[PDB]
Design a protein around this ligand. Structure first.
Ligand SMILES: [Ca+2]
Length: 240
C-alpha cells in the first residue's frame, strides 16, 4: 500500500498473509480474506504459480513475532474457471483456498463480512485497502500491515477514457486514483473494506494497478467485485 498508515492490530482481523515456500523460509506474496474458519478468498493471479503456499492469520508484522499468528497450509485451491492468466482485464480474478486446518477466532482472527449479491457502491463510497504490499512503486513490502483510505470510483467514471477505459469491467470495483495512495505489488488478493450501513464489508479483492506505477492519478486500484461472485463462492464452499 502506497501512502498508507499502520493499521491497528485488531482493525482488520479477516486480513491474511498468503506466503510461499522460499528455500528454508516463507515469503509473503499476496493478501487474502478469511471467509470461513477453513476458507480464504484471494486473487486467482496470486496462485497461478506452481508454488507451495501457506496462510498466516493473526499476522501484523511480517518480520517479527507478534504472539498472535496461526500458520496453516493450503489444502485445495479453487480458481474461478473463467480466469485467464494472460488476461487480467477480463476479470474473474478470484480464487478460494481451503485450509488444512480450521483456524481459531479471536480479536485478531475473524471472518470477513461479505456484501449481499449484486451490491454496487455509489461513487465516492468510503473504503480502506489493507495489506503488506510495496510502500512505493518499485519499492519494498511493508513490515507492518498498512491501510489507506481509497474512495470508490464508479463504473461510468472508471471506464471513461482518462481513467481505465475498456480495461475495467462491471465485475470490478475501482477505488482511489488520487496519485498518492494506492494498492501496490503484494496487496493483490487482499480486501477492500467498505463501510455500508455502519458495518465494514469486504467489497473487493485487490487485482491490479497500472503498469506505469502503483499510485497514478486517474488509475485507481482495481479490485474484483466480491458481490459479483457470491453464488460462485457459496457453490465452491458447498461442493468442497
Ligand atoms: Ca509476525
Amino acid at each position: 500500500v502506497v501512502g498508507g498508515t499502520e493499521a491497528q492490530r485488531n482493525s482488520w482481523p479477516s486480513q491474511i498473509s498468503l506466503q510461499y515456500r522460499s528455500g528454508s523460509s516463507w515469503a509473503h506474496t499476496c493478501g487474502g480474506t478469511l471467509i470461513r474458519q477453513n476458507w480464504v478468498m484471494t486473487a486467482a493471479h496470486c496462485v497461478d504459480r506452481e508454488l507451495t503456499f501457506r496462510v498466516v492469520v493473526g499476522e501484523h508484522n511480517l518480520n517479527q513475532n507478534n504472539g498472535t499468528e496461526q500458520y496453516v497450509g493450503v489444502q485445495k485451491i479453487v480458481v474461478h474457471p473463467y480466469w485467464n492468466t494472460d488476461d487480467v482485464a477480463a476479470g474473474y480474478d478470484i480464487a478460494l483456498l481451503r485450509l488444512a486446518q480450521s483456524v481459531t477466532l479471536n480479536s485478531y482472527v475473524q471472518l470477513g463480512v461479505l456484501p449481499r449479491a449484486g451490491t454496487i457502491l455509489a461513487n465516492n463510497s468510503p473504503c480502506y485497502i489493507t495489506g503488506w504490499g510495496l510502500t512505493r512503486t518499485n519499492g519494498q513490502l511493508a513490515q507492518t500491515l498498512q491501510q489507506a483510505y481509497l474512495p470508490t470510483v464508479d463504473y461510468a467514471i472508471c471506464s471513461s477514457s482518462s481513467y481505465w477505459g475498456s480495461t475495467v469491467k462491471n465485475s470490478m470495483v475501482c477505488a482511489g486514483g488520487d496519485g498518492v495512495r494506492s494498492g501496490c505489488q503484494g496487496d493483490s488478493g487482499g480486501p477492500l473494506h467498505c463501510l455500508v450501513n455502519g458495518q465494514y464489508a469486504v467489497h473487493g479483492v485487490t487485482s491490479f494497478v497500472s503498469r506505469l506505477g502503483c499510485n497514478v492519478t486517474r488509475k485507481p486500484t482495481v479490485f474484483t467485485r466480491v458481490s459479483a461472485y457470491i453464488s460462485w463462492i457459496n457453490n465452491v464452499i458447498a461442493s468442497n
